């Protein structure tokens, strides 16, 4: 009769009926992904909507149960997950507008396009029309309009929609005990648990700034060298001590700096390690990559891929006329139906990606024993972190020697480590400030702390002060810039891409140490070290049953996140960055703009 | 008197865990040569009796019970083991003597579009005793108050497996025969 009894049984009809409706929408999603046709689209939606309708019916039934009255915290992790409502709390009049607003923004982002001012006939989409320009251009003019055309058309059309997206999402957030929309979105990290293993919504804001304070000396040194090399690419178009413009950052928004490597390569003469050519000469087509990756994960003491994985999964692009989506994905379909869909050619990147995606499957297999609600990453940033560390270990020249992709005697030159480390900083640290401004900008916008006219004038104000990114053209109140990003314009949290990279090197540092790696942390290879695999699997197998505070401590040995392990990873680069920045400025002035000159 | 003991077990239709059927094939001698073959079986196992010397031992009164648990639930079919299937369905007694057999009927008992024919009690009031079968589909309420769905806290006890041929090894159907070998002649009392 007690709510404790009435909620366990309620999570034995949900769990039993969830696996069927999730699997039917997983097979259907796979069949649409592995065979794009109108017949499969209707099957996917019909089976997908049944689970969505069932979940919403079950979730509202969960809210009748008072969350406070429970005692066992295992089901509280489940009931709290089920009590989550989102737009459901809003009235039918408001929710239909909100779901329209979400659909309108997603359709405006996806089906919207920007046009060349030189060529009005060509109006390229973002993917792949505008991704190609932003990630593979070197001209000031070509990048400028393509950077702003995507924000003067898509962004401004979302400006009125975001204001009601701010307003309505605050109301549903305020319809529960969440003070604003941001507080609702930082409840992924909020934890009620035993003392010391509990986390607060307020604590996240302090901790993100806490790590970011330590990152800035690393970032600004990296910011300065990237700027110093960039100024050669764009002479007289940027200031030597000025903050970085936004249309030369390797992509549209500035999320990653990885596409600046060709123009910011530390040692251009030394080539980057590539085992593609030898792999074709050893006749690896597509099967060896996943069999060898199976051996690599087996070396660290992780289980090998199941029998069903090999047949059911799509491991090559079909020869016959069957259109498929080539984006790699580690499909956890439920009922131990782990699959990988990947158009893998004979290349090292697919070789590394096959280790990446299979890292998701190793995580998926690990927590598959957890209940249906709890079979996920410890927080939103835990599942991607685990996959990433596998790619770091697989790409080490130490590992490639073991599997025969390198000559028995090869030059492990120190110049090719700065090239590897610097290409690993254009991604890891190129996103840490950007992934912090967004939540900082939004949690104030959701709180209203940024003026409506200065929404895009406290955008650069926040950008220059905390990110080093400056406007290349003046922005009025109309041009909604943050809503020109996929996650913001599709109502997705972006802080998960900050804790992930912070946890990525807390895992790696705590796995190379147990592996007894001697030397720098970048050339660490945990291959053949079963000790490292046993340590990670303990964090993997618990899934989401325990707070991310407890899960992180089990592997890293630290209660909360910290960027000290990530500072060690780039320490060989940092000592090389500091010794290269002696002739260059450090820190960014927040009072410069290129259009003024 | 020569009687096959796998010919019947090669039936196209197999009982589910809820409706397991006690096929008493007794008073006849059969060739255990199939029992030795483990290429076709996947859970050749025994409890309290010799597996290789089962042919030698003639003190057997078989109480073969057939049912279809899935791949992850075959380990649930063990004396002293409990789980979703082992406490609301045919429970193996702690002192059960005999052998437990299984094989992966993924081709036969699973369909690429989903096979939901087989049943098992997800919810029950009390504990199902070993060797006890209950035939009832009354709706279950956690408090125990009779009601009619879709009224809140009133669910259906029986649930069905989402059997597929594409699922992982642990989510494929496994036919299970529980041969309860026993000595018929016992001098319990004068
Ligand atoms: Zn991934």
Residue numbers in the entry:
A (entry chain A): 19 to 615
B (entry chain B): 321 to 510
From the paper:
We prepared complexes of MW-ACE2/SARS-CoV-2 RBD, MW-ACE2/SARS-CoV RBD, SL-ACE2/SARS-CoV-2 RBD and SL-ACE2/SARS-CoV RBD, and solved their structures at resolutions of 2.87, 2.93, 3.03 and 2.89 Å, respectively. However, the MW-ACE2/SARS-CoV RBD and SL-ACE2/SARS-CoV RBD complexes showed more divergent architecture with hACE2 complexed with SARS-CoV RBD, with RMSD of 1.598 Å and 2.069 Å, respectively. Regarding the SL-ACE2 interface, seven substitutions are found, namely Q24L, D30E, H34S, D38E, L79Q, M82T and G354H. Where SL-ACE2 is concerned, the same seven substitutions are also observed. D23, N33, E35 and T324 on SL-ACE2, but not on hACE2, interact with the SARS-CoV RBD. M82, E329 and R393 on hACE2 are involved in the interaction while their counterparts on SL-ACE2 are not. When comparing the interface residues of SL-ACE2/SARS-CoV RBD and hACE2/SARS-CoV RBD complexes, Y440 on the SARS-CoV RBD exclusively binds to hACE2 while D463 and D480 bind to SL-ACE2. The impact of substitutions in SL-ACE2 on the SARS-CoV RBD interaction is basically similar to that of the SARS-CoV-2 RBD. Notably, the main chain of H354 of SL-ACE2 forms an H-bond with G488 on the SARS-CoV RBD while G354 on hACE2 does not, which might result from alteration of loop positioning. In comparison, E38, Y41, Q42, K353 and H354 on SL-ACE2 form an H-bond network with Y449 and Q498, T500, Y449, G502 and D405 on the SARS-CoV-2 RBD, respectively, while H354 on SL-ACE2 is not involved in an H-bond network with the SARS-CoV RBD.
SARS-CoV-2 uses the receptor-binding domain (RBD) in the S protein to interact with angiotensin-converting enzyme 2 (ACE2), which is also the receptor of SARS-CoV. The cellular ACE2 receptor is one of the key determinants of the host range. We found that ACE2s from sperm whales, minke whales, dolphins, sea lions, fur seals and hippopotami could efficiently bind to the RBD of both SARS-CoV and SARS-CoV-2 and facilitate the transduction of SARS-CoV and SARS-CoV-2 pseudoviruses into ACE2-expressing cells. Then, we chose minke whale ACE2 and sea lion ACE2, which displayed high binding affinities to both RBDs, for further study and determined their cryo-electron microscopy (cryo-EM) structures in complex with either SARS-CoV-2 RBD or SARS-CoV RBD.
